[PDB]
Write a protein that binds this ligand. Structure first.
Ligand SMILES: CO[C@@H]1O[C@H](CO)[C@@H](O[C@@H]2O[C@H](CO)[C@@H](O)[C@H](O)[C@H]2NC(C)=O)[C@H](O[C@H](C)C(N)=O)[C@H]1NC(C)=O
Ligand SMILES: CC(=O)N[C@@H]1[C@@H](O)[C@H](O)[C@@H](CO)O[C@H]1O
Ligand SMILES: [Ca+2]
Length: 374
């Protein structure tokens, strides 16, 4: 519709046909008008971004480590019961909780119905918004939370877990008691729901998400790529060692693993296992899943990185990622569609380009590489 009212009146029909009670809709939409801060966040294609280095210093702030240790002690009975019942490690659940909402304290400020209506009406990704808005009305209909406290982030990620509405509907859990899957006010529900999703996402209890490794010299950096998986024994068989030299964890010999270089060949290296992929389903950013893994390790005093972070290391803005893709295509190394997104297709082109220069083929775009291309 042209006006918000027109869009709303039209969407009301679709909600009714999909099972929303008329009074659910009207309590949900009472007071609702488009929210320009949500339109701006949706339009923000973050030019200046990361580096993973900075992002990790946020994630792993000792304030958040210690608050996470307090939460583990404060909710230990509940966490024992979740860990036991879902076969998901308490440390991983608490780490996700810290990453997503700082253990309940930064859940976000926006009404989920308003945010998702705004994005359905005038956002870049209206089909997502429509789908999530409908699912969100079902949640209000079932009674998990009153409309007024249905809070979350500008994109509709809700409560303490930052579930989107369709994920809530399929994975949220009522840990007590009371008929409500309340991921907003109930730590029990929230911890149990995160665990449930992690378990559904492949989590194996007691198994490490990954660990830092030492790469031997003149290592083939081509194999650093999450689409490439090899057994731990076979990485040991190309010389990948524990982080202070020596063997890799025994018993894991057959675990599929990938090699992760979040700051290229001069930064630290990690082998990441199945549980890292579980985390990626929760949030499909390798920087996030690494943060999560290290935060969880930090609650027990681990999470320490042996290899230094490159001092140079400056993240490419959205503009210069697009420029890099264009310069790549112009030298015969095709990155695919010029989308400003360094995926597996671009990395493949970065690597062929790095090889042509005699550089290590980590597939990690640097400001220095963008210079050689001019
Ligand atoms: C206090 O530190 C901030 O904590 C925020 C809550 O943990 C976090 O926002 C979360 O980021 C998640 C992944 O990074 C994302 O899935 C959640 O949706 C989001 N939570 C909310 C309510 O939006 C902050 O991280 C973002 C990326 C930021 N503004 O930097 C985090 N901020 C920092 C500097 O660490
Ligand atoms: C915890 C949660 O809801 N994570 C969702 C993930 O399930 C979904 O595949 C993706 C799609 O946008 O967005 C993430 O935030
Ligand atoms: Ca409940």
């Amino acid at each position: 519709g042209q006006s918000f009212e027109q869009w709303r009146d039209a969407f009301r029909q679709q909600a009714l046909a999909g099972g929303i009670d008329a009074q659910t809709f009207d309590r949900a939409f009472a007071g609702v008008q488009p929210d320009p801060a949500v339109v701006e966040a949706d339009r923000s294609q973050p030019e200046f971004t990361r580096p993973v280095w900075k992002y990790l210093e946020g994630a792993l702030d000792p304030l958040r480590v210690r608050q996470g240790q307090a939460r583990l002690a404060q909710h230990a009975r509940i966490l024992g019961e979740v860990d036991a019942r879902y076969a998901v490690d308490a440390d991983a659940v608490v780490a996700i909780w810290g990453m997503e909402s700082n253990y309940g304290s930064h859940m976000g400020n926006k009404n989920v119905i308003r945010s998702l209506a705004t994005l359905a009406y005038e956002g870049r990704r209206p089909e997502f918004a429509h789908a999530q808005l409908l699912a969100a009305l079902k949640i209000l209909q079932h009674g998990d939370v009153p409309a007024s406290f249905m809070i979350g982030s500008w994109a509709g990620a809700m409560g303490q877990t930052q579930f989107i509405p369709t994920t809530h509907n399929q994975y949220a859990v009522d840990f007590d008691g009371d008929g409500k899957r309340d991921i907003w006010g109930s730590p029990g529900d929230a911890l149990a729901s995160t665990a449930n999703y992690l378990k559904a996402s492949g989590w194996i209890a007691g198994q490490p998400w990954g660990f830092e490794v030492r790469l031997p010299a003149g290592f083939d950096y081509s194999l650093a790529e999450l689409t490439i998986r090899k057994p731990l024994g076979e990485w040991q068989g190309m010389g990948v060692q524990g982080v202070n030299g020596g063997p890799l964890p025994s018993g894991l010999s057959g675990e599929q693993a990938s090699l992760l270089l979040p700051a290229g060949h001069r930064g630290p290296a990690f082998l990441v296992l199945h549980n890292f992929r579980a985390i990626l389903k929760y949030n499909n950013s390798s920087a996030y899943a690494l943060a999560v893994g290290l935060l969880a390790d930090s609650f027990k005093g681990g999470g320490r990185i042996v290899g230094a972070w490159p001092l140079d290391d400056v993240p490419l803005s959205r503009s210069q990622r697009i420029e890099l893709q264009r310069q790549l295509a112009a030298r015969g190394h095709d990155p695919g569609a010029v989308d400003g997104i360094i995926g597996a297709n671009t990395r493949k082109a970065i690597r062929a380009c790095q090889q042509e220069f005699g550089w290590p083929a980590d597939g990690y775009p640097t400001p220095a590489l963008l210079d050689r291309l001019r």
